[PDB]
From a paper:
[name] is an orphan class A G protein-coupled receptor (GPCR) that is predominantly expressed in immune cells and plays important roles in inflammation, fibrosis, and metabolism. [name], still considered an orphan G protein-coupled receptor (GPCR), has been reported to be activated by medium-chain fatty acids (MCFAs) and a range of synthetic compounds. Here, we present cryo-electron microscopy (cryo-EM) structures of Gαi protein-coupled human [name] bound to a synthetic lipid-mimetic ligand, LY237, or a putative endogenous ligand, a medium-chain fatty acid (MCFA) 3-hydroxy lauric acid (3-OH-[name]). We also identify the structural features in [name] that coordinate the polar ends of LY237 and 3-OH-[name], including the interactions with the positively charged side chain of R172 and the downward movement of the extracellular loop 2 (ECL2). Together with molecular dynamics simulations and functional data, our structures reveal that ECL2 not only contributes to direct ligand binding, but also plays a pivotal role in ligand entry from the extracellular milieu.
Considering [name] could be activated by MCFAs or their hydroxylated forms, in order to better understand 3-OH-[name] recognition by [name], we successfully assembled the [name] complex activated by adding exogenous 3-OH-[name] at a concentration of 200 μM (about 8-fold higher than the EC50 of 3-OH-[name] on [name]) throughout the complex preparation process. Finally, we obtained the 3-OH-[name] bound [name] complex at an overall resolution of 2.89 Å using single-particle cryo-EM. The 3-OH-[name] in this structure matches well with our previous model solved without ligand applied. This 3-OH-[name] bound [name] complex presents better density for the bound 3-OH-[name] and the surrounding residues from [name], which structurally provides a reliable template for MCFA recognition by [name], with detailed interactions with the receptor described below. 3-OH-[name] shares an identical nonane tail with LY237, and the nonane tail of 3-OH-[name] projects into the cleft between TM3 and TM5 in a conformation similar to LY237. Meanwhile, the hydroxy substitution points to a hydrophilic pocket formed by Y692.53, N1043.36, and T3597.42 and forms a hydrogen bond with N1043.36. These extensive polar interactions could promote the increased stability of interactions between 3-OH-[name] and [name], which may account for its higher potency compared with that of [name]. The carboxyl head of lauric acid forms a salt bridge with R172ECL2 and a polar interaction with S169ECL2, which can also be found in LY237 binding. In addition, the negative head of lauric acid forms anion-π packing with F3356.51. Despite the presence of similar interaction pairs in both structures, the interactions with R172ECL2 and S169ECL2 were weaker in the 3-OH-[name]-bound structure due to the longer contacts in the 3-OH-[name]-bound structure than in the LY237-bound [name].
Author numbering:
A (entry chain A): 4 to 55, 182 to 234, 241 to 354
B (entry chain G): 7 to 64
C (entry chain S): 2 to 121, 136 to 247
D (entry chain R): 8 to 217, 315 to 395
E (entry chain B): 4 to 340
The structure:
Amino acid sequence: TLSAEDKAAVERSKMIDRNLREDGEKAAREVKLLLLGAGESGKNTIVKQMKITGIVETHFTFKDLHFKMFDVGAQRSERKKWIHCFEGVTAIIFCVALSDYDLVLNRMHASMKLFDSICNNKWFTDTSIILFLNKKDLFEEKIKKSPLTICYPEYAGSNTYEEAAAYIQCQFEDLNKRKDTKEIYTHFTCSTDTKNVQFVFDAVTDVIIKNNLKDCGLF
Amino acid sequence: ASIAQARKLVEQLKMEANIDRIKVSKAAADLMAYCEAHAKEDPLLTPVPASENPFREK
Amino acid sequence: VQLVESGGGLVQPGGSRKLSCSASGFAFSSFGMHWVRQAPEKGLEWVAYISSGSGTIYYADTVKGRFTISRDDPKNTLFLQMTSLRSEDTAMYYCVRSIYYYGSSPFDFWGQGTTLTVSSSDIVMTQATSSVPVTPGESVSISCRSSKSLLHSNGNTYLYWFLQRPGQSPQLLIYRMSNLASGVPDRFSGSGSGTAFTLTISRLEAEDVGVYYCMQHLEYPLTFGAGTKLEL
Amino acid sequence: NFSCYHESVLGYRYVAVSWGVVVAVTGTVGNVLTLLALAIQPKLRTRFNLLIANLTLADLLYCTLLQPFSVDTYLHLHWRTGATFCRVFGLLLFASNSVSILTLCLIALGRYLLIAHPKLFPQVFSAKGIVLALVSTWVVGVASFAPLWPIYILVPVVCTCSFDRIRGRPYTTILMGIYFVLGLSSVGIFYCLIHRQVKRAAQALDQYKLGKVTRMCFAVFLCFALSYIPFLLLNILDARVQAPRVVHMLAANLTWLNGCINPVLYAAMNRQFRQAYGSILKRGPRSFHRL
Amino acid sequence: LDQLRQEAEQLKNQIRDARKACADATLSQITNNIDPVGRIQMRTRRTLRGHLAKIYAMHWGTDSRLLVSASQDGKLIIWDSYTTNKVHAIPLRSSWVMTCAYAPSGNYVACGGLDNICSIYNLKTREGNVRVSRELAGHTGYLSCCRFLDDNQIVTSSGDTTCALWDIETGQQTTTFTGHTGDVMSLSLAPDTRLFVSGACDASAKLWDVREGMCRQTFTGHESDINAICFFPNGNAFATGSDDATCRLFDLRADQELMTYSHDNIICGITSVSFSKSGRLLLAGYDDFNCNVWDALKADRAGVLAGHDNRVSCLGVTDDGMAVATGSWDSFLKIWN
Ligand SMILES: CCCCCCCCC[C@@H](O)CC(=O)O
């Protein structure tokens, strides 16, 4: 039926299979977040708290949950030729700066354009998005003298800090063409970065749960 | 200067203009000849019997 | 790579003892291990085998039940417990690593050996002669025969040729009857007809003299030959 | 002996036949589809989905083979098949119903493990654990309901072959109470805890601001309770048969609900199964004559 | 500036005129009277399973029995195709592997991806474990393909518009091939290894001489990026697949596309291609998870290897042509014969 050497080879193959199964049972548990944003939106800033020319992986364990965050913005190549590698990521962190109204060549509109593509890709239909709107202080100080109209044709009911922030959030969320399949979690870190990681731990949980509810058929 | 790019094109394109040239009919003839010569050596084009197949049915 | 056995010495007939060998310079966790004995004057004899992960443990009928093999991967150590020792057990004991996968070379490395002095159906393999005369620069052949045809259905002829120089551990020369081991000079070659085999040396050089042993690996109760001695 | 004609004539039997044939059809298609989806797609055979597969096989056993012998034997009010096949029928019936209940409990536990403690599920339901559970369900069913072999007769108050109530009362009542407590506690607790976990997860996140899970939990618990609690409690309390007919027939008939609805709750509404069979249908009949 | 642009346009016109002048009769006309191959039905002789995520590349050993497959779960698995036994399982430093290679001598494998590093793994170590022999750095983008020339030379194409021939022992690229306009997505060595062809996202293919270090010919005809290339076994031609959903065949001496493999049903891109040993059959994997076998002389859809659930990703026929393996995004490699 088989030789002794063939039986030993089969035993080694099954050992390899057991090791692969054991490592796969670990890969699924890990959270995997794809980090994106404009050149200076704050990716470096957020990474600097979660830290505690290819893809840059950073691993961190928070509240017994292991996160691998992939900062890929360093790659200057055709996005559509490698974006599909990140189909299974738990969520996409998306950093955008609120002090970008006056940085015309309009860059806020470039951020919304990138957000549209990320929301509506074939690959990320089921992938949730964690929207980090950073540099609130540079926007709270700025809204008092630079109105929203400088960048948007129409602004909120008034050039008020909270109303302007809510209006920006509403527009960014309205770019979601697939509200029935994915959800956007929003944060307003005003350099209060101690909460940042916690937020990612919270939002990610709400993602993970809503994945399991789908797997076991409750959702 | 940007002119270098315009140069790097022609310096390549010109060499392409001097490459070897044959009629595509000859290319087709050689392709067909190779295909027909090695037809018996192809286990996928000409399936071999199980006596020779190493991926024996299981 | 280095294998070092320990626990040698004198033992009283019918007692018990432990031998151990410490693996170094290689991933002991992945290699299967063999204990092979050699009586003071006569040829080799396979004692025991443990596959990596301890999923397979096989013994020779001469010791099965009296000896027990074990391995500790975290410490990279191999152990052999023995009970009810008898005079026949007095011998040198070698540990031989063996990794099994397509194209692998089992029995490649042999340990230095530990001496154990006891106080006062299988495939039969035969070798043509106990001794053969030779001189440097000559071509010399050695013959072998087996009780069963080693040519398996998968096409592999499971014959192994080892060379033991006086005082040194055996070294794998050929595996599966045609495949030269790493570091073996091109002088050596091997062939056979499924049941009759031969190993040939061309331009024979000094330090090639020694005992040539055969082995079959078709069935688990591995059997060695009588050994053929080549002398200047 | 084998005549279940009404002591008090009420003519409920036709409805029992009608409902019966329904459980014969809806239970069969829904179950067989559930298997064709699971068997064809190896990716769909996850460690969790094997519990639903075992439940499906149990409901299939009930709906195809056994259920017809109750649409029959209600029409004639008389057992038409062999008297020895009566014991086989009763054994198989109670074994299938026990397997279904135990699979429902195991699925509730699996869902809770996946949701509240994701790290524990692959350990509890590992390659060894999943098969251990799948075989233990059937083993417990058979062991629990094998010993009543001499007690299986054509009970008149149900017009179908099952365990005689009067003489098997102690052991059968203890078994029934065990199953009632086990099923109710497991399903209710696990699904309440799942809903609580989801609510906690959403509420904790909502703090940063500048569903149908509850519906499914309610559906599952209501389904299980409506299906078995009537029969189980009626038989526990009515240890010595005194209750009116139709009540016993109605209680038994409600247990037929499980045989046909479980492929709805646990297979039809599941995204994985639904998408697998949708892909099967979309790709055409090649799934049968090629794959 | 304008003078050099006009010179480039003039050179393009001249080369187009020459190619038209050489196009006396197409292959389809030449192959009119030769009988077609029959319906090429292939059964799944072996299903290699164990990978946890998308298969992104695979390669055959020259023995036609061992094959390496690379997956995004972070594993290179060296399988024995005859018995489906795992011969090796190699963890990767970066799980983003987009390509893999098997040394023609069988001693080494290689891989690379979004990390921009080509890692070479030595399989014949005395320690008995596979260990990284070298890490080749120097590319500013993801590696798309890797192919061995010797145990000491490897050619790798990257997604920064460049390819490079390296000396593995030294650890530095000895030749750099530049000239592509977009990301270089695929690469194929010639049977003799003196030349290699690279396909890039700019829809063009380029032939390079490994020792001369400069492109010799440029081929065009696809309306979209090229995701795959292979050499016709004779080495005088090569076939490319592109996202425009049609494969195309070019001959080096003719210096133009001999034939095209468009279809009505197929509306999606090609991810991989491979010629059969005789060169009569061209196999191509598609985004709609089914490989198509084309009569390379007549462009008849001779067969379909429909056995995969998720986007087909890579495929390869054994060096002896005995079987063809196809790995797909559902994490299974199926061997067909
Ligand atoms: C004891 C718990 C398991 C079975 C509980 C319900 C018994 C099934 C009865 C019903 O399916 C058939 C009948 O008695 O008419």
